[model samples]
Structure formats: C-alpha cells, structure tokens
Target: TVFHKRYLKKIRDLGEGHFGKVSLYCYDPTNDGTGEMVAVKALWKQEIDILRTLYHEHIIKYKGCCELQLVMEYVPLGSLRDYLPRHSIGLAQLLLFAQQICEGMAYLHSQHYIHRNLAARNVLLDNDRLVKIGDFGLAKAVPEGHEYYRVREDGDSPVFWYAPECLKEYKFYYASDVWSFGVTLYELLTHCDSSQSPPTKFLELIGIAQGQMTVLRLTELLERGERLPRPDKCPCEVYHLMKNCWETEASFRPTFENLIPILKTVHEKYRH
Candidate 1:
C-alpha cells in the first residue's frame, strides 16, 4: 500500500524506532483536521518489509508506506516506559503485559525472525492498555537449517539487554531475544524508572576502565555471572523466571514459547 505525500503531516514526535525517528502524523486525505491520526516512522525499507508481513494481536499494525515513511496504527498510550511510571499499574497487570509480549514474540520466532531489539521503550500500549510490540530491527531471517545469525550491527547497541553470545560473538540466537526480554521484564518490574534503567544498573555494577568500552565491561560482568538485581517488591518466583531468561549460555535460556504458559499461571496467581 502507498500513502499520499502531501496528505501526511507531522504533528509530534513519538520517540525512536529501530529504523529512525517516529512521529505522530495527521493523514489529512481531505486537507482538513478531519483526518486519521497515525504514527509514521522514517527509515530502512528492510524494516517495512518485516513490518508488512507481521500480523498479530500483540504486534503493532502496519499501514501503507509513503516513500521512506511508514504509516502505522497510532497507539495512544505510547510506550510502556512512558506509561508505566506515570500510571500506577499493579503486578498482575504487569505480568499480563509480559504474557502478551511472549505471545507475539513466539509468533515472531515461528516466522523465523529475531526481534533484535525488544525492550519496554519499544512496546506500545493501546487505549484499552493492550501491549503491542513495536520497532523491528534489521530482523534477519534465521536461514534455512540455521538456528542463529552472526550479525554486524550498526553503531552502539543496547548492550545491557544483550546476552553474552550477542555481545561477544555477535551471534543472535532466538535465545538472545529471550535474554533481552528478561531485561525488559526487569524494566516492567522497576516501573521503567530511569534510575533503574539497564545502562544505569550495569554501569554502576561494573565501572568503566581505561581503553575499555562500556560494551566490553558489560560483557565481562555477564561472563562472570553479574546481572541486574531483582527489583523491590518483585515476587521471588517471577525473579526466578527472569533469571532463567538471563542464563549466560544462550542455549540454556527458555524459548518465547516456553514463557507463555508460565506467565499465564503467574498472572493468575498475582491477579486479585
């Protein structure tokens, strides 16, 4: 599908996406304010290729594309990072969000794609508070007969969410996304507080050194069993589940499929 260039007008910035800056736009088909509001992202056509094929309840809906810009369903509540701290959400609700995340992610993996960047900032909440995972990376297809891809990604990455294999060997196994999900779960448990952000948690735990990059220091910590501590008031069982996801050996981590039923039962337990 294609969108009209002149009809699309930017109104506000929503935040960054895997491709580039995403903005709230007015699709004024009639040249009036009486038009549809949508989120538009500018970036790689490769991402649009991935987005177009993804159709799931827990995944963001993709609209037509206009040149380098992609129009998508506007999620009113924005991301979990901005919504969590502002609103008082209960533990049960948070677990529900976690469950839904796995639902979409399982589908993503089954489709042979890895969500290289899965985090609170990348998951959006709709009006009814349903969470939809957004921001498609250069989602590489796990090649036929291959379980992982050795990638050479651009610029600096979210190293704190990265697993040891991802940091050291540049390999993205499906389990690596699970490790990132574990970090995202930590963000949810901490209410996405900046003070407890992934970077802040890792940097203080492992200080920087001369000629050492933050990524190297982070890898050292993970290589030696260091990880983000359990958030206050987080249940022991849930924390244990997070730890399972963060297993140093990528192969030891649970798949997104294994997480769904567990998160479901956990949600029921926490639900009052």
Candidate 2:
C-alpha cells in the first residue's frame, strides 16, 4: 500500500511515536483553499496492518497507509491530556467521555486485542469534542482463552498507568488495560493536576535518587503496594469504580463490558 507522496501536505508536527513522529497534513492539497486535515503517522508494517483491522466510532479512523506511513483521522482538538487541565468540564461531560472510552475498549477486548498503552495522551478529541482512542502501535491481538501475554521491558512504557501484575511480571492483559483506564479516569477527574503527585513522587520521598528513579523503579514501588490518591473532587461512586479497576488481582478488576453500563448509569444520573 503506497500513498502518493503529493496527496498530503505537511502542516506541523503533532507528536512523536515509538517508531516515528506524527504530523498534521492536509488531505487534499488542491481543494478550494479548504481541504480535510489528517494526521499522518509513521509506523511499522505490522502496526499498520493491525490498525487496518480495527474500526469503531471511538477509535481513530485509518484512512490508508503507504509502506510505513499511515494516514488517520485528524483530531484538531488535540488529545485528552491537552484538555484535562485547560477546560472546566461538568460531571455529565466527564462521564460521557469515560463511557465513550469504555465502549472503544470493550470493542477492542471483544476482538481479543489488548491495548497495552492506554492513557490520556493516546485519546484524542475531535472538533466536536468526541473522544477517539488512537495510537495502536503497542496494541496486539491475543489468542482466545489466553489470560495474559508477556511484552519486552520497553523503557518508554507508561509505568504510572501499568497494573500491579504488569509491573511485577511484564504481563499484559485486558485487566491491565482496565488499570490504565482507571489512571486515565483519575486524570480526568483531577483535571490532570499533580497536587497528589504521581508514583514517581512517592519514589523520591522514599530516598530513591532522581537519577535512579527509572520506570522500573517506579513500577517496583507500585508493586510494593503504592497507589494514587483519590481525586479530591471525584464523585464517591466514580472513585469506587476507579478502585475496582485498580484491584490487586487482575481478575477482580471490572471488565469494560461491566464498566460501560455503570458509566452510562452514572452519566444518566448526573446528566439530569
């Protein structure tokens, strides 16, 4: 699959990925001064192929791929992280976002795919404020009946969002993604504030030097029973949901199948 080099005009750099940087591009250069904008990401052939098989409203839409270059839907509003601290959204909106994310995750899990990297930065919002999960570079399809899969200790993995089991055993499963979703929920509830500090801060407090405080060290501390504090303004029920997702036993965590209905209920309650 090779896209014509002239199909997209580069606008600006969006962000960096594990393989290459993502850039904003105009999909139609010769349109009447207004063409659709898109994000062109450079990834491995396998990654592109895996992504082509995925399709959902909450998941980023893949336009096409040329060799290692993949073009995707353009989300001009930026990622969830970009808005977490900048905007003051209401509870209804928050629950809606969470629900949409769960829907996407549910679809992925139902297909036996595990999104190893789930975080605010990987979730993008379109101009209409709709959330879409992106960045499938680390996602992989696991065999049916498999409860977990091992991944290499990639230094770039987000340790703060990893589940206890994953931190301890390098194992990734649907429950591990649920744990990351919980951290992302915290990020949403707290507006990405660092007042409570991240797990890294706990490491610093415990006498670990900053230079030595690697992702592995942070994961070790978390495996030793460290946990993120509940958000000050988070609703009691929502906080409980987050706690359920962070359970020490992966089997104890709430599946996205269960989470969606819960979030919908919460949204309905607060939306009124």
Candidate 3:
C-alpha cells in the first residue's frame, strides 16, 4: 500500500460516506520534511470510476488520487457549516469569503465544469477561515456542446442550499451554482445559528425549473423561510448584491464576473 512507505498515518476518522471513510492523516514529520497534514478520502473503486476527470480548487483538489486512496490538502478548521457558527465573522469577513467562492466557481465554469452540489457543508475552510469549496464527487463536465446535464448524488442533497431553478429540472447549469452561492452569503451574514432552522428546502424534490419566479418572489420566500433579519452587520450595498444573486430567475442572477466587482467594493467598504 502507498501508506506503507509514504510515512503517513491515519490520525482520525472524519466521517463515513457511501464510498468509504474519510480520515485525517499527517505526513510523518521526519520523512516528508514538509510537516504538512493532509486529508485522505478512501473511496470504493466504483466511486473513483466516475470522478476520474474532475479537478478544481473549489471542489476538492485531487493530490494523489488512486483506486485505493485520495489525498487532499487538509482544511484544519473544518467545514463552513461548522465554522460559521463558531466565530463571529463580520460583514467584511463574510464578503471576503463570498468573493473567494465566486472566484472559485468562476474558475470551474471557465474550465467547463459544474459542481452540481454547492452548499456551506461542502465548503471547507482552513485555519485562517480561507474558503475552499469541496465535495465534488457529483461534479461533471459541461462540455461546450451541452448547456445542461443531470447529476446524481449518493447522499441526501441539501435542497435548501440549491438554486430555485434547479428544483424544476434534473439538470445543472453554471448559473444555478451561482444562485447557491447567494444562499451561502445569506448563511454567512446571519451566522446561521441565531436562526431556528436550515433554510427551507425549496427545490429539494423538484427537478431545471428557472425563470418561474420573480426576484421579488425569491426575496420574499427566503426571508419568510429563514426569518433572515436585516443584515444589520453587513453594509447595505453588499446586502443588495446578495439579494441580486438570489434572484429567482437564473437569467436574473448576477454572473460571477459581475459579482467580483461588487464583492471588491464590499470588501473595501467593510474592511477594517
């Protein structure tokens, strides 16, 4: 086995999945020299068969992927879902995280990839809370010839975190992922814990249903469902930007390209 000679040992089991168990591993300080820790996601051979071609920063990086072991950079701080409630990330910090996600998603889009599932739980943050998207086992290529495609997940997909449009159609498009990001902004700004429950699972059972609702409808629905109070902590401008991204129609949603400038502005305005 690779671990037999690689000077790495399993530190702890992080979680179990349909594929297998994901574990925390450390490079043997004496032999690896880097002293950096890594996450080893061991999957069944069947799972690797489908994800052989996928790679992206927002999605988990495939460091030394093989049939038996998949090594990844360890995000010591854990997932965004876990981290958000533990710290008081101010509006500035929230905006910074949002901006990183947008850039990462855009990079994936540029590479003609779609991260079918995008949610806070899928985002991992390092010690600095630097955001990185993860869990792309469901990811697929959006080849130039195809604008939409279907994706299947082995686990319970977080519907509340998905774009409204995705609820109608089984397919995923680049724009839909952008909408998911908008919802993530909502979670970050609100610190989610103060809230009573996860955002309503709007499109959970539904299948590419876009452009059915107005931006106004989405704002109203999400606010009612999450009981999201005014983002007293975030700047008004940034809140407006977040609202724009959560627009009901995929076409109405702000593109990641358009989002970057607004994010930079929020970053500067809210920066301490």
Candidate 4:
C-alpha cells in the first residue's frame, strides 16, 4: 500500500538514532478510528534501500517507506538491552535468545550481508519476547572472495564490541562479525558487565592516566590482545565458545553455520 501523510497519525516519539528520530504512528487504512500501530523511522535512503532487499523471520519486518520515512512492525517490548536488565532470564531463555540470533545472522551471511553494527541494543523483542535483529544502518553486502569491508572513520561506531582486526586495520568480514557475535553472547551471559571493569593493572593505569577510562581506551587494549575478564558465573563451556570467537586470528573464528550447531548442542545440554 502507498504511504501518504494523510493515512498516518503521529502517536509519540520513540527515540533518535544516528540519522534521525523514530516516531510511533497509527495507520488508518480505511480512514477508521481502529488502526494498527507502527513505527516510522526517518533515516537515510541507503538504509531503506538495504532493508527493502532483506526478508528473514528473525529480522525486522519493513512494512513500507515514503521518502526517507520507513514504516516497520511495532515491537512493543523495545530492545533486548532494556529487557534483560529488568528481568531474571533463565538458562533456557538465554539459549533460546542465542539460537534466534544465530539463525538471523546465518541468514544474513548467506545473503552476503554483514551486520557491521551488532549488539544487544540493536536486538529488539516482540510482545512475547521473541528476538529480532534490527538497526541495519551499518549493514553491507560484500563479494564472496572480497569479503573484507572497511569501517567509516566518521561514524559513531561501538569500539567495545568491534573485533580486533576491525579496530587495528578497519577491516570487516564475516569472521569479524562472528567476533562481534561472541561479544554479544558475552553481554547476554554477563548482563553487559564484560567491558565495565579493567582486566589488568596496565589497563587500569592507562584509564587513570587518561583521566577516565572510556571504550576508546578499551579498544586500544583490545588491539594489543587484552580481553574482558571471564564472567564469574559463566559456564565453562560457554566461555570457551566465546573465547573461540575472540581468537586473535580472524581465520580461526567459526562461521555462523558452524557456530549455530554448537550453540544448539550447548542449549540442549543445559536445558532441563
């Protein structure tokens, strides 16, 4: 259906991102009071172009767009970042989250798309808490043999979640994304505390000398092979899997296909 200004009624402001603001809207298809709610994100044309070509169950559904305004299915639960901290999710739930994320990522990789920006904040949940990967402003498609994509120096990238190769050489690839996925897993298991504390005195000194330790300092340490301390209560096997993704050599990381099966086994083993 064509989206015209007359058919959409502005509800409230959701939030703002790097490009523009997102607002809630009520779509009145038949000019009646009973209409379904949707989210309208005003962003760059590039994001709309990329999203238009993608279709996956675990990814955000793009309804339609008029000009730069993109209408998407309204996810009432907000993002995983907001929900995780507020609730005590069990191991089964955590494993389910991991499985859904891997499924979405596997689909993206199969389509030659790399989600350059992946994190808990970018993952949204439906009313039933089903996970869907969202926020594709930094996604890119690369050729098979030439999968190494570079980062834009001007953007507000997340340094803490980036792979070491990405920070050191600005190179991005499927394996680099795998590394970021591992960090996302870590965030899930540890409740987002992996990057909060310094792993060593050297890092502590650097943070103190710099007047304040920021994610930039953390990235610098990561480039030099420093990693976040293993979470205190993280399962040994799960932490090992996270370590495999954090391998200094990009070639050593497992692809999404391989990682998914392993995660599923882990889930089955721990569930019940």
- The candidate scoring highest on TM-score is 1
Looking at model 3, the pairs that clash are 58-133, 167-206, 167-207, 168-207, 168-208, 168-209, 169-207, 169-208, 169-209
lDDT of each: 0.87, 0.81, 0.66, 0.78
Tens digits of per-residue lDDT for model 1 on 199-258? 787766757543345566667889899889999899999999999999999999999999
**Per-residue lDDT for 1-272 in model 2, tens only?**
44666767899998975656899888664666678877898746767777788899999998887545888888888988778778888888988999999999999988789988788888999888898998887888776777887878756777768887776787898999999999888888877666543554455556675466665676666657666766777888898898889888898889999999999999999994
Task: Quote the lDDT for 183 in model 1.
Answer: 96
Off by over 4 Å in 4: 193-220
lDDT score for residue 35 of model 2: 80
By summed lDDT, the worst window of 10 consecutive residues in model 2 runs over 196-205
Q: Mind giving the per-residue lDDT tens digits that candidate 3 earns over 13-86? A: 77753345678887674775556577887654433533454455455565565336867777788887778788
Q: For residues 1-272, could you state the per-residue lDDT of candidate 4 as single tens digits? A: 45877788999987865566778899887977978998898756767877788898889998897645888888999877777778878776787787788889999888888888788878888977888888887888776679688776625775556787776677898898888788788778866543442233335645465335454665576657766656667788888888888888899889888987888888988887
Superposed by TM-score, candidate 3 places the C-alpha of residue 63 at a distance from the truth, in angstroms, of: 1.6
State TM-scores per candidate: 0.95, 0.90, 0.76, 0.88
Local distance difference test, candidate 4: 0.78
User: lDDT of candidate 2?
Assistant: 0.81
